[PDB]
Structure 1
Amino acid sequence: QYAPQTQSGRTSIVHLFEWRWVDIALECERYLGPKGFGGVQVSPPNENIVVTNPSRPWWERYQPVSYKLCTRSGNENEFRDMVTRCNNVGVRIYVDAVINHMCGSGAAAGTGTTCGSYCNPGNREFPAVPYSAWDFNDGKCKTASGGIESYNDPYQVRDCQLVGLLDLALEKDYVRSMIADYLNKLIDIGVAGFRIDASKHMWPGDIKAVLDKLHNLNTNWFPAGSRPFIFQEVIDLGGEAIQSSEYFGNGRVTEFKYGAKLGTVVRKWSGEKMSYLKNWGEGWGFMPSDRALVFVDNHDNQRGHGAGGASILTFWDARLYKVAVGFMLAHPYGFTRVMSSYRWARNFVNGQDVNDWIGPPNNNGVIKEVTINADTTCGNDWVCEHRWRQIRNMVWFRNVVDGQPFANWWDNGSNQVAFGRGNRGFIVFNNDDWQLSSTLQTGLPGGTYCDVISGDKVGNSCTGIKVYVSSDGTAQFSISNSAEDPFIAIHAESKL
């Protein structure tokens, strides 16, 4: 449940948010496999309701109507093809499992659904599963509105409707079994694990009873007896009634404190500074490393009013975002997920983006293909952060240094910091408003190394900055505060 089941030596996954299955299959072969990525988190592959007010938002995909594999990302054949092809080049697929609820209680009855299934939300009828009224928690929720009125009461949080979504009676074996049958179909197809959506809104015990029904992973790609990787979405920034430790028995948990705090530090808000990161990880009150799934932003909080609020760093804030993603990927804490986004027209009204609903790039509702430019960037308003040099090389950095201890920390008492990973990697940051120019101990063997932030090692040369390390492990690092990327990283595989 805790082991990611990636190929040996691969240490991150990427959220290819709202990508079509055919484009993910191609990306696995032409890019993710060759560049050392461990796997992909995909958008929910099961049938959802069609929302027309507003027009096809991203979040319609968190409103299930059946477990048929039929969505705007593609159909069941295309999903299978993607899983097979990705696994065949060593890139695992992790599914976003939406299991707490079905669609909105206020939605109209009919067949406005991604595969044409019928449903009647008002009467709690979902004949394509099938579910009926007694498979929901309406009788169990004690609030007058039927919704969550206080997050201080763990019963309401779990038994009542999250933003009006019909809440499944997860205590019942019939419901646990219908969900297990869906997840087991995906496992047998070749999926490696699951994100469990909205885990805060289910009882840890109910989740566990579903997980105990799951198959071992498919032996065409995994060793016999392998269990699916499980990571649960629980938002707990501390001082809440529900704690992320309640879920540790089932698998890993999203550590949302990580991006919220790192965002604040890198922006230098609330008196925070990078020198405080010396004891990052458990030292900051975070969950144990072997239970954590970490990330700078996710698909919800990149829109600026989720967990972390305005502190969250995203691709819109590109320069600081790269700094935060770089720090994350170099630091040993947690298992890392990299975000991959699309661009939308932000429209702020009272510090609130009123266009935060906008769905992926589309022609009249049909998701646009991911086009690849000659310079390796993406077209059609797909951002492709995972293709940015600074991000892809730090993904490789994490592979190269896997297993090596945190070492050789240095700071200037303010916002210049450095550290290494054993004798295989070293990274240096300048987030201060003045020049960094210092000779630091790197822990690496003497030689000339390419900086993998400003360039690449190509043949026997570097395309960006070169760092000469003395026989005693020291090197000079010079970084201006006006550098495009105010950080440098070198590792064992970037040595000439």
Structure 2
Amino acid sequence: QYSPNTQQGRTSIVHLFEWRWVDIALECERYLAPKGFGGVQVSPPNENVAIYNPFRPWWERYQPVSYKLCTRSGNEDEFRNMVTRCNNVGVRIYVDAVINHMCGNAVSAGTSSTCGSYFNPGSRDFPAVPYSGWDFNDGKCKTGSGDIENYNDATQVRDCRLTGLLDLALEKDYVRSKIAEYMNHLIDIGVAGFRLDASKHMWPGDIKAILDKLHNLNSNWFPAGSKPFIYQAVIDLGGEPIKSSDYFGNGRVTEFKYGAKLGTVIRKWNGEKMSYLKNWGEGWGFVPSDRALVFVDNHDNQRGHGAGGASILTFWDARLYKMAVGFMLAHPYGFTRVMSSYRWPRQFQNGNDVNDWVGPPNNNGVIKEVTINPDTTCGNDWVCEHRWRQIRNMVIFRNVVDGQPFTNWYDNGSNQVAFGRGNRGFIVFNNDDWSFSLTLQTGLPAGTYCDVISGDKINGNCTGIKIYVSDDGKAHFSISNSAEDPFIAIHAESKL
């Protein structure tokens, strides 16, 4: 189950949030492949309801109308074209599968859908699938509102509507078959796996029944007998009757405590300090590394929503963000996902962002293409964190040190720490309010290494800082507390 199915050597996937299929295909060939990224998580590719109030929010894509591959990101031809082009270059595609529900019960009937399909939430008729009132949990849910009201009741969380979203009867073989039909369509096209949206709201057993009906991965790109990579979106911060471990039988699970706690530590809140990261991992109560999908932020919580709370680090806090992502990519715990977002007119009022609903850059609803600037950055309001030198070079760092043990740990008892990965990589952080100047044991072969955070190695040259490792593995590091990027990283492949 639990294998990402990426090409040997590639260790991360990127979430190209709300990107168009055609732009992802180009990105795979011009950037992702040559830069060593393992794969891409795409936004839901199935038809959703077009919500005009507010104007085309990002969350309308989490309200299915049918399973036709027709959305603002593109049609089926473009989707197939993207998967093929990306697979041919060694970059995998993972689909965000919204299978727990359909749209909001209070949405008006009609054809306000991304593909014009007709649907009637009131009568619970989605003829494009087709689903009828007999395919929902209206009869199971026993709350007054028909919605989930108490999260300390596991049954309610599974059988009632998540915020009014029509809850599918996943125990019915008919429903399981329709969903499996959709997922097999994607698998045969070439997708390598799925993010199972709202997994906490589904019974582990139903998810299993659906996975039993799936084909093996397309034999043109994957070894025979390959199984799709499955990671279930379960928000478990502890304290609930539902535990992420209840889903280990189906695949990996998203570890939301990861970004929440790392954000608190980097921000140095709640008395937390970087020296405490010495036992980062299961030691902090996270799920086993072999079942974890980790990230600093995701599409939901970077908007202040979702759970980690106010500790979540985002591209808005660029300096601290790069450090957190840098630490995640260097640490052996779990399988890493990098976020790639778009900017929106954030407007707080009483601590809340009233524009947290805003969708991707657009011209009257039409998603704007991702343009690339001369300096390799993106235009049209796409942030492209995956193109930031500090992030992109750490994605490569993880590939280079893959398999190496966590060793040579150092800390000053405060917020200055360093550690290596075998004899293939070393990284140093300074998050204290004073300079860091020290000679440390790196465990690396003697030589001149390019610091990949401040620069790049380009044919025997470094465009940034150079680190000198002596015959005994010692190297001196200097990091001002007022430095742009208060951390340095070198590895086997940045050596001159």
Q: Which runs of 4+ in 1 moved over 4 A?
A: none
Match of 1:123, SS?
Answer: coil
* 1:413 partner SS: coil
Map of 1:49 onto structure 2: 49
TM-score (norm 2): 1.00
Alpha-carbon distance in 2 for matches of 1:138, 1:207: 20
Partner of 1:202: 202
Superposed counterparts of 1:249-264, under 5 Å: 249-264=249-264
2:79 matched residue in structure 1: 79
1:171-224 C-alpha deviation (Å, 9 max, x unpaired): 000000000000000000000000000000000000000001110000111011
**1:306: how far off?**
1.6
Amino acid at match of 1:73: S
Aligned to 1:233: 233
Output the CA distance in 2 between the equivalents of 1:151 and 1:137: 17
Cα distance between partner residues in 2 of 1:216 and 1:85: 20
Distance 1:381 1:371 in 2: 9
CA distance in 2, matches of 1:214, 1:306: 30
Aligned equivalent of 1:446: 446
Deviation at 1:106, TM superposition (A): 0.2
Q: What 5-or-longer segments of structure 2 have no aligned partner?
A: none
Deviation (angstroms), 1:227: 0.2
Amino acid at match of 2:412: N
2:329 maps to which residue? 329
- The alpha carbon displacement at 1:304 in A equals 0.9
Distance 1:310 1:360 in 2: 23
The alignment status of 1:115 with 2:77, answered yes or no, reads no
Letter in 1 for 2:117: S
- Note the C-alpha offset of 1:161: 0.3
Q: Which residue of 2 aligns with 1:288?
A: 288
What does residue range 420-459 of structure 1 map to in structure 2 within 5 Å? 420-459=420-459
Q: Which residue of 2 aligns with 1:34?
A: 34
Q: How does 1:160-309 map to 2 (within 5 A)?
A: 160-309=160-309
The residue number in structure 2 matching 1:384 is 384
Query: What is the rounded CA distance, in whole Å, between the counterparts of 1:55 and 1:172 in structure 2?
Result: 35
Corresponding pairs, count: 496
Mapped partners of 1:212, 1:261: distance in 2: 35
Aligned partners of 2:306, 2:21: CA distance in 1, in Å?
27
The residue number in structure 2 matching 1:470 is 470
Aligned to 1:459, the other structure's residue is in SS state coil
* Deviation for aligned residue 1:241: 1.4
Aligned partner of 2:313 in structure 1 is 313
Distance in 2, Cα, partners of 1:459 & 1:120: 61
Q: Equivalents in 2 of 1:147, 1:218: separation in Å?
A: 39
Q: Percent of aligned positions with the same letter in both sequences?
A: 87
Code of the aligned partner of 1:216: N
Letter in 2 for 1:240: E
1:305 is displaced (CA, Å) by 2.5
**Which segments of 5 or more consecutive residues in structure 1 lack a partner in the other structure?**
none
Q: Residues of 1 paired with 2:31 and 2:370: CA distance?
A: 13
1:53 positional shift: 1.0
Determine helix, strand or coil for the equivalent of 1:461: coil
Partner Cα distance (1:239, 1:273) in 2:
25
Shift of 1:225: 0.5
1:490 corresponds to: 490
In the aligned structure 1, how far is the partner of 2:238 from the partner of 2:467? 42
Partner amino acid, structure 1, of 2:246: E
1:9-55 deviation line (CA, Å, top 9, x unaligned): 00000000000000000000000000000000000000000101100
Residue 460 of structure 1 and its aligned partner are, at CA, apart by 1.0
- Per-residue deviation, residues 113-151 of structure 1 (Å, max 9, x unmatched): 000000000010000000000100000001011011110
Matching residue of 2:365: 365
How many angstroms apart in 1 are the aligned matches of 2:53 and 2:371?
Answer: 29
3-state DSSP of counterpart to 1:370: coil
TM-score normalised by length of structure 1: 1.00
User: Which residue in the other structure is 2:403 paired with?
Assistant: 403
Give SS of 2:262's match. Answer: helix
Partner of 2:99: 99
Residue in structure 1 matched with residue 344 of structure 2 by the alignment? 344
RMSD of the alignment, in Å? 0.4
